[PDB]
Amino acid sequence: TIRQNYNETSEAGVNKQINLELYASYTYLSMAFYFDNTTVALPGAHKYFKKASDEEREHAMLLMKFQNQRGGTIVLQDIKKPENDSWGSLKDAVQAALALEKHVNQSLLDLHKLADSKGDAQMCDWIETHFLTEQVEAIKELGDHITQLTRVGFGLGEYTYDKENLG
Amino acid sequence: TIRQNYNETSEAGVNKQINLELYASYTYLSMAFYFDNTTVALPGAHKYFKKASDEEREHAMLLMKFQNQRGGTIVLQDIKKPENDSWGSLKDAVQAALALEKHVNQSLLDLHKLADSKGDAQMCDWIETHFLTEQVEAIKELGDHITQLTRVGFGLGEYTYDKENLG
Amino acid sequence: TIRQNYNETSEAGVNKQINLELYASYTYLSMAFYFDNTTVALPGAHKYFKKASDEEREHAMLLMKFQNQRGGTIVLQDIKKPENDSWGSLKDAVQAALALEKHVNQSLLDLHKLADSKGDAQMCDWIETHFLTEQVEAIKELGDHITQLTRVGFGLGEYTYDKENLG
Amino acid sequence: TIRQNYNETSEAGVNKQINLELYASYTYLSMAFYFDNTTVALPGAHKYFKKASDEEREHAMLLMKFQNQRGGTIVLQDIKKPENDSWGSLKDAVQAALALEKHVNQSLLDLHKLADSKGDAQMCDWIETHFLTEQVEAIKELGDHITQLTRVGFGLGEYTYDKENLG
Amino acid sequence: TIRQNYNETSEAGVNKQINLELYASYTYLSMAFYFDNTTVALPGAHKYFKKASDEEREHAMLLMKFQNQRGGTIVLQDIKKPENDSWGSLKDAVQAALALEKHVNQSLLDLHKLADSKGDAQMCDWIETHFLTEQVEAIKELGDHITQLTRVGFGLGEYTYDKENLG
Amino acid sequence: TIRQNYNETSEAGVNKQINLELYASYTYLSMAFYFDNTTVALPGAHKYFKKASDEEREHAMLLMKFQNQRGGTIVLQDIKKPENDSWGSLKDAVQAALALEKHVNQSLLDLHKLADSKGDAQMCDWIETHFLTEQVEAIKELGDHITQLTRVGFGLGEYTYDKENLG
Amino acid sequence: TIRQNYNETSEAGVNKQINLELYASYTYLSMAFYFDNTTVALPGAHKYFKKASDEEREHAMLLMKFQNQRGGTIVLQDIKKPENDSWGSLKDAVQAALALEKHVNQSLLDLHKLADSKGDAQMCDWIETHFLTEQVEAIKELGDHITQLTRVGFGLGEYTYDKENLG
């Protein structure tokens, strides 16, 4: 028996967070191929959101690994389809990505507070080390892109920022 | 308009195959991390079904890209959760994968037959080029794994084939 | 006698397609040197359409080679002058290139359907392998350029896309 | 079970084409060592037809492999002895090979036609990918050798082509 | 004076954990040379448990270093002799080590809990950074070895795992 | 305005020479693939007249570029099909090419005489620099090929000079 | 808005710590150039406290960056001048630095306790990661320098430790 100091509601929250990072993986994939659509056509954003979808999928597998290491049982649910089919302008899509990563951050903070309430020192530091500082950086990066996309405006600017920054 | 000789029924099956390949990616991920579970503990299979999950995910993006190249529209649906939570013995899982890649093959074949009936020569060759011959080889490999897993038996055999073959 | 399973109307269609790809070679050359004209002056487009004229000329020689390999007889006709003398804005010229490559695609699809009706398995796969997927990619690429040229607008944008993309 | 969309008359055709490609291997061997005979003594042809024998033997193994991938059963038959013991002039032997690869081509086309009649999309592409275009090129090459061997005539010319071309 | 926010019961706990990590070092040494004994003769395990002994001895020195950095006083005690003289089957010994690192884990958690109760933020992170996550991975690894050693069974299997895995 | 000392009659002859060089490119292409025809089968000449077609096409773009550099306007006309469909013997074709490059020379000479009569010093040197001395060498080479093709005779000779000289 | 789980009192302490670390940078600079003064003349310490000034300045920018990453607002205040103009003996200065890094530690600890009380898990780990364990090591090093400076005495000793240790 490897399980030690690993609460059962902790275990249930990791199962949830796994679903959330998969849901995020699938939302970014939806964005990536929206900018590959011929009537949108921003290759840099295609690149940028494909990698994002790769990363939160890593997130999920890092949480899957942690579940096994602590001695719990992975339990999967349906990954729900993304909230939209099309994503508007390049600025609109980065605003949704900001809203999405803030939603993920809040869950990671709730999981941390949960783990903390049950005295799980290791699960706290694991979440601090793999997710919390990286979320903070993800959020600040998106925040800067939104300021920039507003600064360059529409038309020529949207093209330029796609190519020269997101790619 | 880039759309040419691309039938709306073909477009809908593509979306249907995007969901299917994503479904297979999510099943393999389930298996991969079942073999990482401490009570199962087969690192070779864990490695083997993790790559398999990557492949059918690559399959989905290859279809997403093709939907865009032909001037269609991606429409995503939920990714249903895997049929099982645990996957039994190493031989039991390889059988489970054989049944899945056959299901996907029949689906890819029906999608070919649909495309052919609408006169879509390029779609036919594209499915032939990227999917039909790969499925044949994938099924043949699963079959040989099943035969070899039966030859090596349970216990020491299952270990050996895990490390030496799938690893 | 090398001729085997090679229909006489097939042979007549290859002779036609040779003329069409030459006509396309000559249209792109007309575009390439229109952007080299001092009152137009977009060097990137000059590059971009010179290479296009090189490529459909390869197309012709690939069809000439196939004619000989199958045992037919190449028969040449006049290459007709391009439909226009000047080609308008950079966006206007890429729209004509989209119309031209769709016209070529349709002929390649008609030749395929023709070859198919006469049971010519090899000529079908030859057309699938050298022309059909490449046409699909050519069309999607042009489609994206047209979206982008509309996005960046006129003046500064037209210059920027010429230099940073087409060159 | 791995067999899927693999019809029993297709499987019987595959067994017939393994025998024919082995039969062709054995004719080419016969010729290659005819030219090694001291009353003939054409070292270039020996080397050329030895290689062609390796070639159609690789064909046979390629088909045996395909039979196993689809879940068929290889069933072998006697390989009949070549039609002749000696092969006349070098030009006579190249004409014998042209006739032979045309027979193989027709047989390969009939196998495709049967595969297509049962809706075996994958079998059709496999034959297209590995055999149909390679047969066209081999036939054209033999055709060009026959024209060239007529051009150089007999005596000194036959010597020259053997050494400078077939070697 | 360098001591700062370093409480006396924390300092006493550090002295207790130096003894325990030295005790663990000395158990692993006992096992490693049990497997070197000619009636046992498992060279992989000898090498694996020798290294684990070096390991928990590095742990001890890491803690002695920490005691000095905070301005504590190292106070050493006898290292008790391991609980057994011989360690049964290889699987028996891996079970003995699992039990041992769990004891160390619980002790390490209690030390964290005490450090946190006195508000020693730095002591908590130090234990998180150097010990807590490493203990989880060691426990999971021992757990996986125990499942695998059951899988290969006794006799030939025990031989194989010793050489191919622990070595 | 960049146009200086560039007479309108000179401008029109340039367009007339663009057509002529394109006409020569299309003739050589016709010859090149006549020698690739299985009943003719002279790979050396095929290679030789393919390069020749590339050269006079380079000639046309060199004239197109010069029309633009002097501030004129390209006006394209049809490219007439080659005078013959087949080209007889290897010697017969080299004679056909000699007659063509002489025609092109007289045309280039008349274009020089026209430019000189209008006082266009730069155009004169440009034609001298890029065309007059190249035509002299091209004609001299064709002449030597004709003399050598007559020396080597028909049959074996024609083969030999094809492979060893034009190849 | 990027601001999430970032309390306004935490924001104000960050600004307060930016000032403190800048204050320490300006103190070390004062010391560094006291040891460069001709009547003091200890190049090793000059080098040692110049680097120390660089470090706590790096500390301030690391806090400035963190204020921005969390969506707060930098507010700068005066940097007060160092407590002394001269710094006495080499041992006297190292004691002065030990008192300063302890002051900064208590400040960093209170900032941690403040962040923890407002539930800011990421801020806590960030301070742990970048500051708490570095301060422990910095204080331990100053302590050892003080002990060594007392062992080597005044005069020749002070020289020796300056060049051989701080240099």
Author numbering:
A (entry chain A), B (entry chain H), C (entry chain A), D (entry chain B), E (entry chain B), F (entry chain H), ...: 3 to 169
Authors' own words:
Canonical ferritin is composed of 24 subunits, which self-assemble into a quasi-spherical nanocage with an outer diameter of ~12 nm and an interior diameter of ~8 nm. Ferritin has prominent octahedral 4-3-2 symmetry, and each ferritin molecule contains 24 C3–C4 interfaces, 12 C2 interfaces, 8 C3 interfaces, and 6 C4 interfaces, which provide several potential pathways for metal ions and small organic molecules to diffuse into its inner cavity.
As a proof-of-concept study, we introduced His/Phe at the C4 interface of AfFer and created 3D protein nanocage arrays with two different lattice arrangements, including SC and BCT. As expected, crystallographic analysis revealed that the designed residue sites are involved in interactions between the proteins in the two 3D lattices.
